[PDB]
Write a protein that binds this ligand. Structure first.
Ligand SMILES: *[C@@H]1O[C@H](CO[C@H]2O[C@@H](C)[C@@H](O)[C@@H](O)[C@@H]2O)[C@@H](O[C@@H]2O[C@H](CO)[C@@H](O)[C@H](O)[C@H]2NC(C)=O)[C@H](O)[C@H]1NC(C)=O
Ligand SMILES: *[C@@H]1O[C@H](CO[C@H]2O[C@@H](C)[C@@H](O)[C@@H](O)[C@@H]2O)[C@@H](O[C@@H]2O[C@H](CO)[C@@H](O)[C@H](O)[C@H]2NC(C)=O)[C@H](O)[C@H]1NC(C)=O
Ligand SMILES: *[C@@H]1O[C@H](CO[C@H]2O[C@@H](C)[C@@H](O)[C@@H](O)[C@@H]2O)[C@@H](O[C@@H]2O[C@H](CO)[C@@H](O)[C@H](O)[C@H]2NC(C)=O)[C@H](O)[C@H]1NC(C)=O
Ligand SMILES: *[C@@H]1O[C@H](CO[C@H]2O[C@@H](C)[C@@H](O)[C@@H](O)[C@@H]2O)[C@@H](O[C@@H]2O[C@H](CO)[C@@H](O)[C@H](O)[C@H]2NC(C)=O)[C@H](O)[C@H]1NC(C)=O
Ligand SMILES: *[C@@H]1O[C@H](CO[C@H]2O[C@@H](C)[C@@H](O)[C@@H](O)[C@@H]2O)[C@@H](O)[C@H](O)[C@H]1NC(C)=O
Ligand SMILES: *[C@@H]1O[C@H](CO[C@H]2O[C@@H](C)[C@@H](O)[C@@H](O)[C@@H]2O)[C@@H](O)[C@H](O)[C@H]1NC(C)=O
Ligand SMILES: *[C@@H]1O[C@H](CO)[C@@H](O)[C@H](O)[C@H]1NC(C)=O
Ligand SMILES: *[C@@H]1O[C@H](CO)[C@@H](O)[C@H](O)[C@H]1NC(C)=O
Ligand SMILES: *[C@@H]1O[C@H](CO)[C@@H](O)[C@H](O)[C@H]1NC(C)=O
Ligand SMILES: *[C@@H]1O[C@H](CO)[C@@H](O)[C@H](O)[C@H]1NC(C)=O
Ligand SMILES: *[C@H]1O[C@H](CO)[C@@H](O)[C@H](O)[C@H]1NC(C)=O
Ligand SMILES: *[C@H]1O[C@H](CO)[C@@H](O)[C@H](O)[C@H]1NC(C)=O
Ligand SMILES: [Cl-]
Ligand SMILES: [Cl-]
Ligand SMILES: [Cl-]
Ligand SMILES: [Cl-]
Ligand SMILES: [Cl-]
Ligand SMILES: [Cl-]
Ligand SMILES: [Cl-]
Ligand SMILES: [Cl-]
Ligand SMILES: [Cl-]
Ligand SMILES: [Cl-]
Ligand SMILES: [Cl-]
Ligand SMILES: [F-]
Ligand SMILES: [K+]
Ligand SMILES: [K+]
Ligand SMILES: [K+]
Lengths: 527, 176, 352
C-alpha cells in the first residue's frame, strides 16, 4: 500500500511486475477542473483540493473524438483508437515511477499525436512502465482536448480563444513542476517528448513563453510546427468556427451568442460536423488545430523560428523512412492495404488531386516533374513509391529537417535520426515500409518484453534507443557509451550529419533528402 | 581459418575469430558464413586498399575512393556470394552498354556513368559525371576519408569504410 | 568542515580534497556526486581514480556478496530486511572473518566490498557520467608512481619474495597472470603475455619479473589514471599530471620493487623536511618542492614552484598530454606516458 501526498491531496497507486522488478503506476490523476457546462471551449481551470484518497489505479476517460472506422477488426488501424470511455471529463494524467522510489530522477513527459483531432495517453504503445523499470526515469503522460473541443477559435474572445488543448498540456507540465518532487522526480530535469501532432506540440512549447520554465529539453518524433498541417491561419479558423455554427443551426452573431449556442449542443453533434467545416479535406486534414491566439503563441511561428525567439536548449529530432505510406490508403485511388498497389501515371495524378486539393494546376505539375524523373527501367512500382515520398517529404521529413537547421543556427546542440527499421510485427503490408508512428513501440521499449514476439535483433535496437533517449533526457547527449556504439554527431547546417537507426549497421550520413527538400522548402511555398 | 592463415600462430587465429564473431546477434544461421568472407576480403583487399589510399594522399595528391556494391544480374555464381571479386570489370569496360546482351536498363545506366567517370579521371584527373545531376565525388583525405558508393539505386557519400575491421588488420594483426 | 572550519581560522570556500589509491578513487567520486559539489573547491588524485578496474562493484556482484556473507554467517533468510537484522546481531569479528570468502577467487587487489551505484551518492554508472561530462567543473591534479604494481606481486604471485631478487620464468609469469586475472579467458591472458613479452631483447634475466609488475601497475593504476585525466580535461578544465619516480632512501622493501605504490605519500606530507629523520639532503629538497606545488594548487589552482627557478608544470590536454616527472635529479616535461601499453588496456582489453 503506497500513497503520495500532492498539493491537492493524497493519491493511491498500484504495484506492477516488470522484468523481475517493480514499477509504481499512478493512472488517472486529475489535473484540472472537468471542462464541462460553461467551461466548454475555455482554457483549463485549476483544481480544488480534495480530502480523500484519490485512487489512481485505472486509466481515465479519453477526450471526445471521432474514431477511425476505415478498417473495422484490423489491428493496424484500431491500435490507435481510444481504449477508455470518451467524455469531456478527460483532463487526467499518469505517472510511472521506479521501485525502489528514486531520489531525484529525470522526468520524461509524453505528448501523443493524432493530428490534433484524436489520440489518448492510455494506448498500449505509450505505456511507460518499461522506461521506468529499465532506465529508472519517471514517465508522465496527459490527456488534452482535441478537435473542436480543444482548438475552436474566435481570436481574442476568451469564451473560445483557441489553443485550449495546448493549455491543457501546459497546465499538466505545471502539475509536474509543483508535484513531481513528492514522487521522487526532479522538476529541474524534465524532457518533453512526443510524436506527430505531439511532436508539433513539443515544438510550440519551445516557442511559448509560458512553457519556457516548465521543462529542460525536447524530443520531436515525426512532427514540428512548421509542417504544412500544423498551424491554422486566423482566417481559416474563423471560417471553420462559423461553418460549424451554420452546420449546427448555431449561426448568430453577437459572437458570444454563437459560443453559448455551441455549449448547449452535445458532443456528438459537434463531432459529427467537424469533418465538413472545410470544403475539401485530405487524409491529413487538421480541421481544428493550433492558432496564433496572442496568448500561447504571440506571433506567426515561422517568424519566431526564423528570428531566434524560442527556448535555448538541446533538441533531438527524427523521422521514419516511409512517413507518407500510411495516408495513401485513406483515399488515394488504386491503393489498398490488401494488395501491392501498383498504380498508373493517371492514378498518381488523381492521387495528387486528393492530397493537394487547391493547389493550382502548375503546382501539381511541379510535383510530378520533381518526383517522376525515373532512374529508370519501369520498374512497375515507380509511381506507387513516388506518391508515398511526396506525401512523406512535404508533410514530415522536410519540415523536420528545416526546423532542425533553423533551431541549431542559434547555437544549440541538435541531433537528428533517420529511423529505418520495419517492425516484424507490423500488421500493414510490406510495400508500406517503415510507416508513420511505428518507431514509438521501440522508444517505449515494448520489444524488451521477451514474451512478446519481437526478434532478438529488435530487442537490441529497442534497448539501444531507450538508452540514447534517456541519456539525452538526463545529460543532453544521446550516446550509448558502453557497447562500442556509433557516436551520434551533432547536427549543424553546413554538414547536416544524422544517425540511422536499424537493426543491421547504424550509420553517420549527411544531408537527408537534399534534392527533395530544396523543392519543398524553396520552390513549393511560392506556388 | 586454418586454410587461409596456414601458419599463423594459434593466438593469431583466435584474434581473428574474436574480432569477427562478436554477434549482433540472433543467430542468424549465416553468421559464420558471412564472417569468413569478410575476414578474407578485409585482410586481402579492402584494408590494404584503404591504407594505400591514405598514405598516398598524405603527400598532397588528390585521391578518390569507391565502394562497388552492385551484383551483376548475369552473375553465374550463387547469391550468398554477393558482389564478388572481379565483377566490376564488365561495368568499367562497358559491356552493359550492349542492349543485345541481357543486362537490365538500370545496369546500362550504372555502366554509362562509371565509364564516364573513368574517362573524366583519365582526361582531366577528376572522376565526375558533370551533366546528369550526379552525386559529386569528394576527394579522399585521411581525417575525413570520404568515399563514393556505386550501385544502381542511390549513390552515396560515406566515410571511414570498414573502420573497426581495418584497425584490427592494419594495427594489430602485423604484430602476431 | 563547511559548518565549522571558519571557527578554526579556515576558509570553507577554499578546500582541496586529496587522497591516495582508494582515497584517490574516493576523491574522484566526490567529483561525480551531486551532494558533494558544494563541499570543496579542487581535487588531487594520487595513484587512484574510480575507473580503475578494482574501484566500483557492479550491482550484481554486490548482492551476490551480501548474500554469500549471509550464508557464511548462518544469516540466510529472505525478507531481505530479515537478513540485515541478523547481520546486526553478529559481531564484528564474524563479519570480518567472512569477508574474504564472499568472492570465489580473489586477487591481491580484491575489493570485496566497495562503492556501488546506489541511486543516492552515485546516480548512474560512473563511466557514463565521466564520458558525458556530468561532474564538478574545477582543476584537478593527478599522478602515479613508476612501479605501482610491484607491491602486489609478493602477496601471491609464484617465484616472488621480498627477500630475494625474484627472477621468474616464462611459466611463473603465466601462473602469475592466473593469480591476477582469475577468469579472464585463455585468450585474454595470452593477449597480455603477447603485449608485454615482446623483448627488446638480450634476455636480460629479469625480463619476466619486470613485465608482471608493469602489467599489474598499468592495468590497475596508471592507465585508468591517464584515461580519467583526458576525459576530465576534455570538458575544458585545467589538469596537471605527474609521474613520481623517486625511490625513498628509507624504503624497507628490496630494490627490484622500485618506486612502489604508496611511497610518494611521505613526500607529499613533508616527512623528509624533518632533519633528525635519516632522509638525504636531495630528498628534503624534493619534498619541499612537492609540498609547495601541492599547496599552490590548493590555494591558487596552479601547482607551480615560482621562486627557485623551477620547471614549469604545463597543463594536461588530450592531444599533447604533457606530464611532469618528480625525482631528485632533473625534473622533466614529457608526453604521452605509457602510450603503447594503455592503448592495449583501454581499447582492446575491455572487449575480452
Ligand atoms: C470559407 O467558407 C465557405 C463556407 O462554405 C461551406 O459551408 C459549410 C457550412 C460546409 O457545409 C461546406 O461544405 C461549404 O462548402 C467556403 O465556400 C464554399 O466553397 C466551395 C468550394 O469552392 C463551394 O463550392 C461551396 O458551395 C461554398 N459554399 C458556400 C455556402 O458559399 C469557403 O471556401 C471557405 N474556406 C475555408 C473553410 O477554408
Ligand atoms: C488493389 O485494390 C484496390 C482497392 O479497392 C479494392 O480492394 C481490392 C482488394 C479489390 O478486391 C476491389 O474489389 C476493391 O474495390 C483496387 O482499386 C480498385 O480497382 C477497381 C477495379 O479493380 C476500380 O474499378 C476501383 O475504382 C478501385 N476501387 C477503389 C475503392 O478505389 C486496385 O485496383 C487493386 N490493385 C491491384 C490488385 O494491384
Ligand atoms: C555468485 O554466488 C555463488 C556463491 O558461491 C560461493 O558460496 C559462498 C558462500 C562462498 O563460500 C564461495 O567460496 C562459494 O564459491 C558463486 O558460485 C560458486 O562458484 C565457484 C567457482 O566457479 C564454484 O566452484 C562454487 O562451488 C560455487 N558455489 C556454489 C555454492 O554454488 C558465483 O560464482 C558467485 N559470483 C561472484 C561472487 O562474483
Ligand atoms: C625467492 O624466494 C621464493 C619465495 O619462497 C621462498 O622464500 C625464500 C626466501 C626461500 O628461502 C624459500 O624457502 C621460500 O619458500 C622462492 O619461491 C619458491 O621456490 C621454491 C624452491 O626454491 C619452490 O619450490 C616454491 O614453491 C616457491 N615458494 C613459494 C612459497 O612460492 C624463489 O624460488 C626464490 N627465488 C630466487 C632465489 O631467485
Ligand atoms: C535534484 O537535482 C537538482 C539539480 O539537478 C539538475 O540541474 C539542472 C540544471 C539540470 O542540469 C538537471 O538535468 C540536473 O539533474 C538540485 O538543485 C536539487 O536540490 C536536487 N534535489 C534533491 C536531491 O532532492
Ligand atoms: C575568506 O575568503 C573568502 C573568499 O576567498 C576565496 O574565494 C573563493 C571563490 C576561492 O577562490 C578561494 O580559493 C578564495 O580564497 C571571502 O568571501 C571571505 O569573506 C573570507 N573570510 C574572512 C576573511 O574571514
Ligand atoms: C480505492 O481502492 C482500494 C482497493 O484496493 C479500496 O480499498 C479503497 O477504499 C478504494 N476507494 C474507493 C473505491 O473509493
Ligand atoms: C549492452 O550489453 C549487453 C549485451 O551484451 C546488454 O545485455 C546490455 O543491456 C546492453 N546495454 C545497452 C545500453 O544497450
Ligand atoms: C545522361 O543522359 C541520358 C539519359 O537521359 C543518357 O542517354 C546519356 O548518355 C547520359 N550520360 C551519361 C554520361 O551518363
Ligand atoms: C627555495 O630556496 C631555498 C634553498 O636555497 C630553500 O631553503 C627554500 O625553502 C626553497 N623553497 C622552495 C619552495 O622550494
Ligand atoms: C453582445 O452580448 C454581450 C452579452 O453577453 C454584451 O456584453 C456585449 O454588448 C456583446 N458582446 C461582446 C463580446 O462585447
Ligand atoms: C518484510 O518485513 C517487514 C517488517 O520488517 C515488512 O514491513 C515488509 O512486509 C517486508 N519487507 C520490506 C522491505 O518491504
Ligand atoms: Cl518479463
Ligand atoms: Cl530512403
Ligand atoms: Cl500527361
Ligand atoms: Cl552501433
Ligand atoms: Cl556531404
Ligand atoms: Cl547519382
Ligand atoms: Cl564520420
Ligand atoms: Cl618507466
Ligand atoms: Cl608457451
Ligand atoms: Cl626543477
Ligand atoms: Cl610527442
Ligand atoms: F499526429
Ligand atoms: K536521400
Ligand atoms: K562498414
Ligand atoms: K613510457
Amino acid at each position: 500500500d503506497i500513497i503520495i501526498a500532492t498539493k491537492n491531496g493524497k493519491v493511491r497507486g498500484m504495484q506492477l511486475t516488470v522484468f523481475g522488478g517493480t514499477v509504481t503506476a499512478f493512472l488517472g490523476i486529475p489535473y484540472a477542473q472537468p471542462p464541462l457546462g460553461r467551461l466548454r471551449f475555455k482554457k483549463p481551470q485549476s483544481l480544488t483540493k480534495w480530502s480523500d484518497i484519490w485512487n489512481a489505479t485505472k486509466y481515465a476517460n479519453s477526450c471526445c473524438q471521432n474514431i477511425d472506422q476505415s478498417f473495422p477488426g484490423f489491428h493496424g488501424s484500431e491500435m490507435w483508437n481510444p481504449n477508455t470511455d470518451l467524455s469531456e471529463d478527460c483532463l487526467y494524467l499518469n505517472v510511472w515511477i521506479p521501485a525502489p522510489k528514486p531520489k531525484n530522477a529525470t522526468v520524461l513527459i509524453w505528448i501523443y499525436g493524432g493530428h490534433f483531432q484524436t489520440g489518448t495517453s492510455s494506448l498500449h504503445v505509450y505505456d511507460g512502465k518499461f522506461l521506468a523499470r529499465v532506465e529508472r526515469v519517471i514517465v508522465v503522460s496527459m490527456n488534452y482536448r482535441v478537435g473542436a473541443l480543444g482548438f475552436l477559435a474566435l481570436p481574442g474572445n476568451p469564451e473560445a480563444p483557441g489553443n485550449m488543448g495546448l493549455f491543457d498540456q501546459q497546465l499538466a507540465l505545471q502539475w509536474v513542476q509543483k508535484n513531481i518532487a513528492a514522487f521522487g522526480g526532479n522538476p529541474k530535469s524534465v524532457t518533453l517528448f512526443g510524436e506527430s501532432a505531439g511532436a508539433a506540440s513539443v515544438s510550440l512549447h519551445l516557442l511559448s513563453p509560458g512553457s519556457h520554465s516548465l521543462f529542460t529539453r525536447a524530443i520531436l518524433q515525426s512532427g514540428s510546427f512548421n509542417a504544412p498541417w500544423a498551424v491554422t491561419s486566423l482566417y481559416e479558423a474563423r471560417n471553420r468556427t462559423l461553418n460549424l455554427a451554420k452546420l449546427t443551426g448555431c449561426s448568430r452573431e453577437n459572437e458570444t451568442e454563437i459560443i453559448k449556442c455551441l455549449r448547449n449542443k452535445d458532443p456528438q453533434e459537434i463531432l459529427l460536423n467537424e469533418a465538413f467545416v472545410v470544403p475539401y479535406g485530405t487524409p491529413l486534414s487538421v480541421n481544428f488545430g493550433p492558432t496564433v491566439d496572442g496568448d500561447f503563441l504571440t506571433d506567426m511561428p515561422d517568424i519566431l523560428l526564423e528570428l531566434g525567439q524560442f527556448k535555448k536548449t538541446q533538441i533531438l529530432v527524427g523521422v521514419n523512412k516511409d512517413e507518407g505510406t500510411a495516408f495513401l490508403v485513406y483515399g488515394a485511388p488504386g491503393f489498398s492495404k490488401d494488395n501491392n498497389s501498383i498504380i498508373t501515371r493517371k492514378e498518381f495524378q488523381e492521387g495528387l488531386k486528393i492530397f493537394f486539393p487547391g493547389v493550382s494546376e502548375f503546382g501539381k505539375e511541379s510535383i510530378l516533374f520533381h518526383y517522376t524523373d525515373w532512374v529508370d527501367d519501369q520498374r512497375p512500382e515507380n509511381y506507387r513509391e513516388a506518391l508515398g515520398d511526396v506525401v512523406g517529404d512535404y508533410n514530415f521529413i522536410c519540415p523536420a529537417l528545416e526546423f532542425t537547421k533553423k533551431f541549431s543556427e542559434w547555437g544549440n546542440n541538435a541531433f537528428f535520426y533517420y529511423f529505418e527499421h520495419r517492425s516484424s510485427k507490423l500488421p500493414w503490408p510490406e510495400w508500406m515500409g517503415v510507416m508513420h508512428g511505428y518507431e514509438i513501440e521501440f522508444v517505449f521499449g515494448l520489444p524488451l518484453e521477451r514474451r512478446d514476439q519481437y526478434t532478438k535483433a529488435e530487442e537490441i535496437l529497442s534497448r539501444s534507443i531507450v538508452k540514447r533517449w534517456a541519456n539525452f533526457a538526463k545529460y543532453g547527449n544521446p550516446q550509448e557509451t558502453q557497447n562500442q556504439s556509433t557516436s551520434w554527431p551533432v547536427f549543424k547546417s553546413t554538414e547536416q550529419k544524422y544517425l540511422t537507426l536499424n537493426t543491421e549497421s547504424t550509420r553517420i550520413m549527411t544531408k537527408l533528402r537534399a534534392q527533395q527538400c530544396r523543392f519543398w522548402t524553396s520552390f513549393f511555398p511560392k506556388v
